[PDB]
Amino acid sequence: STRLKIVTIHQEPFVYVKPTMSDGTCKEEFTVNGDPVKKVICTGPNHTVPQCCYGFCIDLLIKLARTMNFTYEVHLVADGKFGTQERVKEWNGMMGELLSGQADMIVAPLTINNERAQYIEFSKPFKYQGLTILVKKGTRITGINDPRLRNPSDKFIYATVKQSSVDIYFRRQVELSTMYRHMEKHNYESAAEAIQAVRDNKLHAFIWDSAVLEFEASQKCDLVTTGELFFRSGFGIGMRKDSPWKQNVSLSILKSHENGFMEDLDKTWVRYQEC
Amino acid sequence: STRLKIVTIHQEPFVYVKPTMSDGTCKEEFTVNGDPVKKVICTGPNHTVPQCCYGFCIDLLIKLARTMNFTYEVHLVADGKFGTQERVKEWNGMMGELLSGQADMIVAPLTINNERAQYIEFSKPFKYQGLTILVKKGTRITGINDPRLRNPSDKFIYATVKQSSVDIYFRRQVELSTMYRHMEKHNYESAAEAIQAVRDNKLHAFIWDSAVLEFEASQKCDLVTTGELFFRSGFGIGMRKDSPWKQNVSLSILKSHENGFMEDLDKTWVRYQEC
């Protein structure tokens, strides 16, 4: 009947965003084994214009749309954010768009957490992840229990992104009190700057989402992730409560974990051999 | 109004099962730091009798019951099984008990998968896991892509449990065809026997649930798990579809991942230092 409004956000390798060619089409590209890269037009801010979206999440959308037989239009979130609750409390970003009806589904690396789940519903997770630690190659940190994290000094500086979900996690547990006070002093304004600081040896360890950090390490051989994951979670498709789509989207995702499909998406988008 | 009927199954460290003392009570025990071990009476086959249940899942039940203010009675599944669909197709084990009304909730290390999710609903996961590989200490296997798994010979024998979810997973993907044919020749009748065979160097690698194998390695220093997890999944509380309990059980579980509670259960039940 009517096309679902899909909202997404720019985050490689889940969603790449590139300009259209001069004729308005998306450049034809192929995988190493000759398969066409599937691309969709996604409108959004560069001024709102049609752009080209592809990646793990786009391939997943396409699989869901074809399996469940729905049609869709994809756009990039207008304010460029995942969504937090803020005073004007109302959700902004993709959460706000989903709740307002500007979107019908959020298809993106959207972490399942208590706060969001109070307002929306999630599919079963299409990818598992957690927090991990990004360091310079050669640096050894066992995880959140490493003595250089538990007993901080300026000889080994670690941090996360100010006001992020990570910042909030450390703030909330008394046993991490000592780590939180160190981080509160070194936290960065954005993940990109924290990542650069590790490359530049101004930050010894950056604590962040594993799906982000592992992707950085796969592309930049002077960086690596280290240690046991902690605060595990999953990424799910977001829908308003009592969605007609949730059950079948969840069943498709579970089937895909079990039949190789999700693994094929990981081989296609997440796995590299440069480093 | 009425007590929820909780069904569970014996699997350390999630559910320990021990006899009552001579007077019918459960032995008072304490953690290393002095805290009482919480125990519940769980009736079930040793002839159905009251026994003592405690562990990660029992602590979780207790937290849910107190948070949501419900009361409950726990029993061990009558046929001793998680549940498969079989001809008489009807579910047996905990699935069958849940569907028949003999249980209202399954509180156990119950893997979320497509087949079960067709019939029941799950809470958000209280523990993440996957498949991993159990080997003798000193043996090195990178994961499911290790050359000694991909290119099998009788110099390095690996196997799983016949007719298990693992057996079925390998059967279903063409790219694992060669591994499946090796395993089909060495598979064991039960996880206990496969585990013993690794200890006895009759089986070089056993492919199984990480929550099981990691627990074995934590208790038996001649065994270790090795390699990257694969076929990740989660354990969830099982309820009949459209349960009044699901939303609040899921919200509690998500909060517990975020506030230290789940981590405390891992420190209490899963973490050891002998090995």
Coordinates of C-alpha atoms in Angstrom, one line a residue:
Chain A
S1 CA 0.0 0.0 0.0
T2 CA 2.4 2.8 1.2
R3 CA 6.2 2.8 1.3
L4 CA 7.8 2.4 4.8
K5 CA 9.8 5.4 5.8
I6 CA 13.2 4.1 6.8
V7 CA 15.5 6.4 8.8
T8 CA 19.3 5.7 9.0
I9 CA 22.5 7.4 9.9
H10 CA 26.0 7.6 8.4
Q11 CA 28.3 5.1 10.0
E12 CA 30.7 2.8 8.1
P13 CA 30.6 -0.1 7.5
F14 CA 26.9 -0.2 8.3
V15 CA 25.9 2.7 6.2
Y16 CA 28.2 4.4 3.7
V17 CA 27.0 7.7 2.2
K18 CA 28.3 9.0 -1.1
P19 CA 27.2 11.7 -3.6
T20 CA 25.3 10.7 -6.7
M21 CA 27.1 10.9 -10.0
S22 CA 26.4 13.8 -12.4
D23 CA 23.4 12.0 -13.9
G24 CA 21.8 11.4 -10.5
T25 CA 22.6 7.7 -10.3
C26 CA 24.8 5.8 -7.9
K27 CA 28.2 4.6 -9.3
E28 CA 28.1 0.9 -10.2
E29 CA 30.6 -0.9 -8.0
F30 CA 31.3 -4.7 -7.4
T31 CA 32.8 -6.9 -4.7
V32 CA 36.1 -8.7 -5.1
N33 CA 34.1 -11.7 -6.4
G34 CA 32.2 -9.8 -9.0
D35 CA 28.9 -9.3 -7.1
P36 CA 27.2 -5.9 -7.6
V37 CA 27.2 -3.6 -4.5
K38 CA 23.6 -2.9 -3.8
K39 CA 22.9 0.8 -3.3
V40 CA 19.8 2.7 -2.4
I41 CA 19.0 6.4 -2.8
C42 CA 18.8 8.1 0.6
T43 CA 17.8 11.7 0.8
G44 CA 19.3 13.8 3.5
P45 CA 21.5 16.8 4.4
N46 CA 24.8 17.0 2.6
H47 CA 20.1 21.4 2.1
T48 CA 18.5 18.0 1.6
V49 CA 19.5 16.0 -1.4
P50 CA 19.5 12.4 -2.8
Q51 CA 22.7 10.6 -1.9
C52 CA 23.8 7.0 -2.2
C53 CA 23.6 4.6 0.8
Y54 CA 25.0 1.0 1.0
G55 CA 26.6 -1.2 3.6
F56 CA 25.7 -3.9 6.1
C57 CA 22.4 -2.2 7.2
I58 CA 21.3 -1.5 3.6
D59 CA 21.9 -5.1 2.6
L60 CA 19.9 -6.1 5.7
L61 CA 17.0 -3.8 4.8
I62 CA 16.9 -5.1 1.2
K63 CA 16.8 -8.7 2.6
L64 CA 13.9 -7.8 4.9
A65 CA 12.0 -5.9 2.3
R66 CA 12.2 -8.8 -0.2
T67 CA 11.5 -11.5 2.4
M68 CA 8.4 -9.7 3.9
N69 CA 7.4 -8.0 0.6
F70 CA 7.3 -4.4 1.7
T71 CA 8.5 -1.3 -0.2
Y72 CA 10.4 1.6 1.4
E73 CA 12.1 5.0 1.1
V74 CA 15.3 5.7 3.0
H75 CA 16.4 9.0 4.4
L76 CA 19.3 10.1 6.6
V77 CA 18.2 11.5 10.0
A78 CA 17.7 15.3 9.6
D79 CA 19.6 16.3 12.7
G80 CA 22.4 13.8 12.3
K81 CA 21.8 12.1 15.7
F82 CA 20.9 8.7 17.1
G83 CA 18.6 10.5 19.6
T84 CA 18.8 11.6 23.3
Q85 CA 16.0 13.0 25.5
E86 CA 16.4 16.7 25.8
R87 CA 14.5 19.7 27.1
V88 CA 12.7 22.0 24.6
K89 CA 11.8 16.2 27.5
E90 CA 11.5 15.0 23.9
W91 CA 13.6 12.6 21.9
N92 CA 15.7 14.0 19.1
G93 CA 17.5 12.2 16.3
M94 CA 16.2 8.9 14.9
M95 CA 14.3 8.2 18.1
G96 CA 12.3 11.4 17.7
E97 CA 11.7 10.8 14.0
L98 CA 10.5 7.3 14.8
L99 CA 8.2 8.5 17.5
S100 CA 6.8 11.4 15.5
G101 CA 6.0 9.3 12.4
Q102 CA 8.7 10.9 10.3
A103 CA 10.1 7.4 10.2
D104 CA 8.5 3.9 10.4
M105 CA 11.7 2.0 11.1
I106 CA 15.2 2.9 12.3
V107 CA 17.6 0.7 10.3
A108 CA 21.0 1.6 11.7
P109 CA 23.6 0.5 14.3
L110 CA 21.1 1.4 17.1
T111 CA 22.0 0.0 20.4
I112 CA 19.3 -1.8 22.4
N113 CA 19.1 -0.2 25.9
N114 CA 16.7 0.3 28.7
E115 CA 16.0 4.0 28.1
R116 CA 15.1 3.5 24.4
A117 CA 13.2 0.3 25.1
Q118 CA 10.9 2.3 27.4
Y119 CA 9.7 4.3 24.3
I120 CA 10.1 2.0 21.3
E121 CA 10.4 -1.6 20.5
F122 CA 13.4 -3.4 18.9
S123 CA 13.8 -6.4 16.7
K124 CA 16.0 -9.2 17.8
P125 CA 19.6 -8.0 17.4
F126 CA 21.3 -8.2 14.0
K127 CA 24.8 -7.7 15.4
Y128 CA 26.3 -8.2 18.9
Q129 CA 28.8 -5.8 20.3
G130 CA 30.0 -4.2 23.5
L131 CA 32.6 -1.8 24.7
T132 CA 36.3 -2.3 23.9
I133 CA 39.5 -0.3 24.0
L134 CA 41.5 1.2 21.2
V135 CA 45.2 1.6 21.7
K136 CA 48.3 2.0 19.6
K137 CA 49.7 -1.2 18.1
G138 CA 52.0 -2.9 20.6
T139 CA 50.1 -1.6 23.6
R140 CA 48.7 -4.3 25.9
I141 CA 45.5 -3.8 28.0
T142 CA 43.5 -6.8 29.3
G143 CA 40.2 -5.0 29.6
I144 CA 38.3 -3.0 32.1
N145 CA 40.1 -4.7 35.0
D146 CA 43.6 -3.9 33.7
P147 CA 45.8 -2.5 36.5
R148 CA 46.6 0.6 34.4
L149 CA 42.9 1.4 34.1
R150 CA 42.0 0.5 37.7
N151 CA 44.9 2.5 39.1
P152 CA 45.2 5.5 36.8
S153 CA 48.0 8.0 36.3
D154 CA 49.1 10.4 33.7
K155 CA 51.6 7.8 32.4
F156 CA 48.7 6.0 30.8
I157 CA 45.8 8.3 29.9
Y158 CA 42.4 6.8 28.9
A159 CA 39.1 8.5 28.1
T160 CA 35.8 8.3 26.3
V161 CA 33.5 10.8 24.6
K162 CA 31.9 13.4 27.0
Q163 CA 28.2 12.9 27.7
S164 CA 28.1 9.7 25.8
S165 CA 26.5 6.4 26.8
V166 CA 29.9 5.3 27.9
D167 CA 30.5 8.3 30.1
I168 CA 27.1 7.6 31.7
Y169 CA 27.9 3.9 32.3
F170 CA 31.1 4.7 34.2
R171 CA 29.3 7.4 36.2
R172 CA 26.8 5.0 37.5
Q173 CA 28.8 2.3 39.3
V174 CA 30.6 3.0 42.5
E175 CA 33.3 0.4 41.8
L176 CA 34.4 2.4 38.7
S177 CA 34.5 5.6 40.7
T178 CA 38.3 5.9 40.4
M179 CA 38.3 5.3 36.7
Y180 CA 35.4 7.7 36.1
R181 CA 37.3 10.5 37.8
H182 CA 40.3 10.0 35.6
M183 CA 38.2 9.9 32.5
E184 CA 36.1 12.9 33.5
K185 CA 39.4 14.8 33.2
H186 CA 40.4 13.6 29.8
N187 CA 37.2 13.0 27.9
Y188 CA 37.0 14.1 24.3
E189 CA 34.3 16.1 22.4
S190 CA 33.9 13.4 19.7
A191 CA 35.0 9.9 18.8
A192 CA 36.8 11.1 15.8
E193 CA 39.1 13.4 17.8
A194 CA 39.7 10.7 20.5
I195 CA 40.6 8.3 17.7
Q196 CA 43.1 10.7 16.2
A197 CA 44.6 11.4 19.6
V198 CA 45.4 7.7 20.0
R199 CA 47.1 7.7 16.5
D200 CA 49.0 10.8 17.7
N201 CA 50.0 9.2 21.1
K202 CA 48.2 12.0 23.0
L203 CA 45.7 9.5 24.4
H204 CA 46.8 6.0 25.3
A205 CA 43.4 4.3 25.3
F206 CA 40.0 5.2 24.0
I207 CA 36.9 3.3 25.4
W208 CA 34.2 3.0 22.8
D209 CA 31.7 0.8 20.9
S210 CA 33.4 -2.3 19.5
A211 CA 31.7 -2.1 16.1
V212 CA 33.3 1.4 15.7
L213 CA 36.7 0.6 17.1
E214 CA 37.2 -2.8 15.3
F215 CA 36.3 -1.1 12.1
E216 CA 39.0 1.6 12.8
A217 CA 41.6 -1.1 13.5
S218 CA 40.7 -3.0 10.3
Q219 CA 41.5 0.2 8.3
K220 CA 44.4 1.8 10.2
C221 CA 47.2 -0.6 11.0
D222 CA 48.8 1.6 13.7
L223 CA 45.7 1.1 15.8
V224 CA 44.3 -2.1 17.4
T225 CA 41.6 -3.0 19.8
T226 CA 42.6 -4.8 23.0
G227 CA 41.1 -6.7 25.9
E228 CA 37.9 -8.5 26.7
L229 CA 34.6 -6.8 25.6
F230 CA 32.5 -5.5 28.4
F231 CA 29.0 -4.0 28.7
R232 CA 27.8 -6.2 25.9
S233 CA 24.7 -5.3 24.0
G234 CA 23.2 -5.6 20.5
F235 CA 22.0 -3.5 17.6
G236 CA 18.4 -3.8 16.7
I237 CA 15.9 -2.4 14.2
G238 CA 13.8 0.2 16.0
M239 CA 10.0 0.4 15.5
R240 CA 7.1 2.1 17.4
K241 CA 5.4 -0.1 20.0
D242 CA 2.9 -2.7 18.6
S243 CA 4.4 -2.5 15.1
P244 CA 3.0 -4.9 12.5
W245 CA 6.5 -5.5 11.3
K246 CA 8.4 -6.6 14.5
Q247 CA 7.6 -10.3 14.7
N248 CA 8.6 -11.0 11.1
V249 CA 11.6 -8.7 11.1
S250 CA 12.8 -10.6 14.3
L251 CA 12.2 -14.0 12.8
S252 CA 14.1 -13.1 9.6
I253 CA 17.0 -11.8 11.6
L254 CA 17.1 -15.0 13.8
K255 CA 17.0 -17.1 10.7
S256 CA 19.8 -15.1 9.2
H257 CA 22.1 -15.8 12.2
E258 CA 21.4 -19.4 11.7
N259 CA 21.7 -19.9 8.0
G260 CA 24.9 -18.0 7.0
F261 CA 23.2 -14.8 5.8
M262 CA 24.5 -12.6 8.7
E263 CA 27.9 -14.2 8.4
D264 CA 28.0 -13.4 4.7
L265 CA 27.2 -9.7 5.6
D266 CA 30.2 -9.8 8.0
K267 CA 32.5 -11.2 5.3
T268 CA 31.2 -8.6 2.8
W269 CA 31.5 -5.5 5.0
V270 CA 33.4 -6.1 8.3
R271 CA 36.3 -8.5 7.5
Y272 CA 39.7 -7.1 6.1
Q273 CA 43.2 -8.4 5.7
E274 CA 45.4 -5.3 5.3
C275 CA 46.3 -5.4 9.0
Chain B
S1 CA -3.1 -13.5 43.2
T2 CA -1.5 -16.9 42.1
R3 CA 2.1 -18.0 42.1
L4 CA 3.9 -18.1 38.8
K5 CA 5.0 -21.6 37.8
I6 CA 8.7 -21.3 37.0
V7 CA 10.4 -24.2 35.1
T8 CA 14.2 -24.6 35.1
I9 CA 16.8 -27.2 34.4
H10 CA 20.0 -28.4 36.0
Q11 CA 23.1 -26.6 34.5
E12 CA 25.9 -25.1 36.6
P13 CA 26.6 -22.3 37.2
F14 CA 23.1 -21.1 36.2
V15 CA 21.2 -23.6 38.2
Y16 CA 22.8 -25.9 40.8
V17 CA 20.6 -28.7 42.2
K18 CA 21.4 -30.3 45.6
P19 CA 19.4 -32.5 48.0
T20 CA 17.7 -30.9 51.0
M21 CA 19.2 -31.7 54.4
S22 CA 17.6 -34.2 56.8
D23 CA 15.1 -31.7 58.1
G24 CA 14.0 -30.6 54.6
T25 CA 15.8 -27.3 54.6
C26 CA 18.7 -26.2 52.3
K27 CA 22.1 -26.0 53.8
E28 CA 23.1 -22.4 54.7
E29 CA 26.1 -21.4 52.7
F30 CA 27.9 -18.0 52.2
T31 CA 30.0 -16.3 49.5
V32 CA 33.7 -15.5 50.1
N33 CA 32.6 -12.1 51.3
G34 CA 30.1 -13.4 53.8
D35 CA 26.8 -12.9 51.8
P36 CA 24.3 -15.7 52.1
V37 CA 23.8 -17.8 49.0
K38 CA 20.1 -17.4 48.1
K39 CA 18.5 -20.8 47.6
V40 CA 15.0 -21.8 46.5
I41 CA 13.2 -25.1 46.9
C42 CA 12.7 -26.7 43.4
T43 CA 10.7 -29.8 43.1
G44 CA 11.6 -32.4 40.5
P45 CA 12.9 -35.8 39.7
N46 CA 16.0 -36.9 41.7
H47 CA 10.2 -39.8 41.9
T48 CA 9.5 -36.1 42.4
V49 CA 10.9 -34.4 45.5
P50 CA 11.9 -31.0 46.9
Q51 CA 15.5 -30.2 46.1
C52 CA 17.6 -27.0 46.5
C53 CA 18.3 -24.7 43.5
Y54 CA 20.6 -21.7 43.4
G55 CA 22.9 -20.0 40.9
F56 CA 22.9 -17.2 38.3
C57 CA 19.4 -17.9 37.1
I58 CA 17.9 -18.3 40.6
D59 CA 19.5 -14.9 41.7
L60 CA 18.0 -13.4 38.5
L61 CA 14.5 -14.8 39.3
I62 CA 14.7 -13.5 42.8
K63 CA 15.6 -10.0 41.5
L64 CA 12.8 -10.1 39.0
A65 CA 10.2 -11.3 41.5
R66 CA 11.1 -8.6 44.0
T67 CA 11.3 -5.8 41.4
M68 CA 8.0 -6.7 39.7
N69 CA 6.4 -8.0 43.0
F70 CA 5.2 -11.4 41.9
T71 CA 5.4 -14.7 43.8
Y72 CA 6.5 -18.1 42.3
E73 CA 7.1 -21.8 42.7
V74 CA 10.1 -23.4 40.9
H75 CA 10.3 -26.9 39.5
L76 CA 12.8 -28.8 37.4
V77 CA 11.6 -29.9 34.0
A78 CA 9.9 -33.3 34.3
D79 CA 11.6 -34.9 31.3
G80 CA 15.0 -33.2 31.9
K81 CA 15.1 -31.5 28.5
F82 CA 15.2 -28.0 27.1
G83 CA 12.7 -29.1 24.4
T84 CA 12.7 -30.2 20.8
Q85 CA 9.8 -30.8 18.4
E86 CA 9.1 -34.5 18.1
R87 CA 6.4 -36.8 16.7
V88 CA 4.0 -38.4 19.1
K89 CA 4.9 -32.6 16.1
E90 CA 4.8 -31.4 19.7
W91 CA 7.5 -29.7 21.8
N92 CA 8.9 -31.6 24.7
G93 CA 11.0 -30.4 27.7
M94 CA 10.6 -26.8 29.0
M95 CA 9.1 -25.6 25.7
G96 CA 6.3 -28.2 26.0
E97 CA 5.7 -27.3 29.7
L98 CA 5.6 -23.6 28.9
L99 CA 3.2 -24.1 26.0
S100 CA 0.9 -26.5 28.0
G101 CA 0.6 -24.2 31.0
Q102 CA 2.6 -26.5 33.3
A103 CA 5.0 -23.6 33.4
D104 CA 4.4 -19.8 33.1
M105 CA 8.1 -18.9 32.6
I106 CA 11.2 -20.8 31.7
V107 CA 14.1 -19.4 33.7
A108 CA 17.2 -21.2 32.5
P109 CA 20.0 -20.9 30.0
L110 CA 17.5 -21.0 27.2
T111 CA 19.0 -20.0 23.8
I112 CA 17.0 -17.5 21.7
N113 CA 16.6 -19.0 18.2
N114 CA 14.2 -18.8 15.3
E115 CA 12.5 -22.1 15.9
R116 CA 11.6 -21.4 19.5
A117 CA 10.7 -17.8 18.8
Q118 CA 8.0 -19.1 16.3
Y119 CA 6.1 -20.6 19.3
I120 CA 7.1 -18.6 22.4
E121 CA 8.4 -15.1 23.3
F122 CA 11.6 -14.2 25.0
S123 CA 12.8 -11.5 27.2
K124 CA 15.8 -9.5 26.2
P125 CA 18.9 -11.6 26.8
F126 CA 20.4 -11.9 30.3
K127 CA 23.6 -13.3 29.0
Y128 CA 25.3 -13.4 25.6
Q129 CA 27.1 -16.4 24.4
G130 CA 28.0 -18.3 21.2
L131 CA 29.9 -21.4 20.1
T132 CA 33.5 -21.9 21.1
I133 CA 36.0 -24.7 21.1
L134 CA 37.3 -26.8 24.0
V135 CA 40.8 -28.2 23.7
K136 CA 43.6 -29.5 26.0
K137 CA 45.7 -26.8 27.6
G138 CA 48.5 -25.8 25.2
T139 CA 46.5 -26.5 22.0
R140 CA 46.0 -23.5 19.7
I141 CA 42.9 -23.2 17.4
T142 CA 42.0 -19.7 16.1
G143 CA 38.3 -20.4 15.6
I144 CA 36.0 -21.9 13.0
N145 CA 38.4 -20.8 10.3
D146 CA 41.5 -22.5 11.6
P147 CA 43.3 -24.6 9.0
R148 CA 43.0 -27.8 11.1
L149 CA 39.3 -27.4 11.2
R150 CA 38.8 -26.4 7.6
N151 CA 41.1 -29.1 6.3
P152 CA 40.4 -32.1 8.6
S153 CA 42.4 -35.2 9.2
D154 CA 42.6 -37.9 11.9
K155 CA 45.7 -36.1 13.3
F156 CA 43.3 -33.5 14.8
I157 CA 39.8 -34.8 15.5
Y158 CA 37.0 -32.4 16.4
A159 CA 33.3 -33.1 17.0
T160 CA 30.1 -31.9 18.6
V161 CA 27.1 -33.6 20.2
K162 CA 25.0 -35.7 17.7
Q163 CA 21.6 -34.2 16.8
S164 CA 22.3 -31.0 18.7
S165 CA 21.7 -27.4 17.6
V166 CA 25.4 -27.4 16.7
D167 CA 25.2 -30.5 14.5
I168 CA 22.2 -28.9 12.8
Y169 CA 24.1 -25.5 12.3
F170 CA 27.0 -27.2 10.5
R171 CA 24.6 -29.3 8.4
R172 CA 22.9 -26.2 7.0
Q173 CA 25.8 -24.3 5.4
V174 CA 27.4 -25.5 2.2
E175 CA 30.7 -23.8 3.0
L176 CA 31.0 -25.9 6.2
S177 CA 30.3 -29.1 4.2
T178 CA 33.8 -30.5 4.7
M179 CA 33.9 -29.8 8.4
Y180 CA 30.4 -31.3 8.8
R181 CA 31.4 -34.6 7.1
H182 CA 34.4 -35.0 9.5
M183 CA 32.2 -34.2 12.5
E184 CA 29.4 -36.5 11.4
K185 CA 32.0 -39.3 11.8
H186 CA 33.2 -38.4 15.3
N187 CA 30.2 -36.8 17.0
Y188 CA 29.5 -37.8 20.7
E189 CA 26.2 -38.9 22.4
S190 CA 26.5 -36.2 25.0
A191 CA 28.5 -33.2 26.0
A192 CA 29.8 -34.9 29.2
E193 CA 31.4 -37.7 27.2
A194 CA 32.8 -35.3 24.6
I195 CA 34.3 -33.2 27.4
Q196 CA 35.8 -36.3 29.1
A197 CA 37.3 -37.4 25.7
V198 CA 39.2 -34.1 25.4
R199 CA 40.6 -34.6 28.9
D200 CA 41.6 -38.1 27.8
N201 CA 43.1 -36.9 24.5
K202 CA 40.7 -39.0 22.5
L203 CA 39.1 -35.9 21.0
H204 CA 41.2 -32.9 20.1
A205 CA 38.5 -30.3 20.0
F206 CA 34.9 -30.1 21.2
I207 CA 32.6 -27.5 19.6
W208 CA 29.9 -26.4 22.0
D209 CA 28.1 -23.6 23.9
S210 CA 30.5 -21.1 25.4
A211 CA 28.6 -20.8 28.6
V212 CA 29.1 -24.5 29.1
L213 CA 32.7 -24.7 27.9
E214 CA 34.0 -21.6 29.7
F215 CA 32.6 -23.0 32.9
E216 CA 34.4 -26.3 32.3
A217 CA 37.7 -24.5 31.7
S218 CA 37.3 -22.5 34.9
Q219 CA 37.0 -25.7 36.9
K220 CA 39.4 -28.1 35.1
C221 CA 42.8 -26.6 34.5
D222 CA 43.8 -29.2 31.9
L223 CA 41.1 -27.8 29.6
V224 CA 40.8 -24.4 27.9
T225 CA 38.5 -22.7 25.4
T226 CA 40.2 -21.3 22.3
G227 CA 39.4 -19.1 19.4
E228 CA 36.9 -16.4 18.4
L229 CA 33.3 -17.1 19.4
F230 CA 31.0 -17.8 16.4
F231 CA 27.3 -18.2 15.9
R232 CA 26.6 -15.7 18.7
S233 CA 23.3 -15.7 20.5
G234 CA 21.7 -14.9 23.8
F235 CA 19.9 -16.6 26.7
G236 CA 16.4 -15.2 27.5
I237 CA 13.6 -15.9 29.8
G238 CA 10.8 -17.8 27.9
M239 CA 7.1 -16.9 28.2
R240 CA 4.0 -17.7 26.2
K241 CA 3.1 -15.1 23.5
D242 CA 1.4 -11.9 24.8
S243 CA 2.6 -12.5 28.4
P244 CA 1.8 -9.8 30.8
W245 CA 5.3 -10.2 32.2
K246 CA 7.5 -9.8 29.2
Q247 CA 7.9 -6.0 29.0
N248 CA 8.9 -5.5 32.6
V249 CA 11.1 -8.6 32.7
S250 CA 12.9 -7.2 29.6
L251 CA 13.2 -3.7 31.1
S252 CA 14.6 -5.1 34.3
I253 CA 17.2 -7.2 32.5
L254 CA 18.3 -4.2 30.4
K255 CA 18.6 -2.1 33.5
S256 CA 20.7 -4.8 35.1
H257 CA 23.2 -4.9 32.2
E258 CA 23.6 -1.2 32.6
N259 CA 23.8 -0.8 36.4
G260 CA 26.2 -3.5 37.5
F261 CA 23.7 -6.1 38.6
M262 CA 24.4 -8.6 35.8
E263 CA 28.1 -8.0 36.2
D264 CA 27.8 -8.8 39.9
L265 CA 26.1 -12.1 39.0
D266 CA 29.0 -12.9 36.7
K267 CA 31.5 -12.1 39.5
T268 CA 29.4 -14.3 41.9
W269 CA 28.9 -17.3 39.7
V270 CA 31.0 -17.3 36.6
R271 CA 34.5 -15.9 37.5
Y272 CA 37.2 -18.1 39.1
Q273 CA 41.0 -17.9 39.6
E274 CA 42.1 -21.5 40.1
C275 CA 43.2 -21.8 36.5

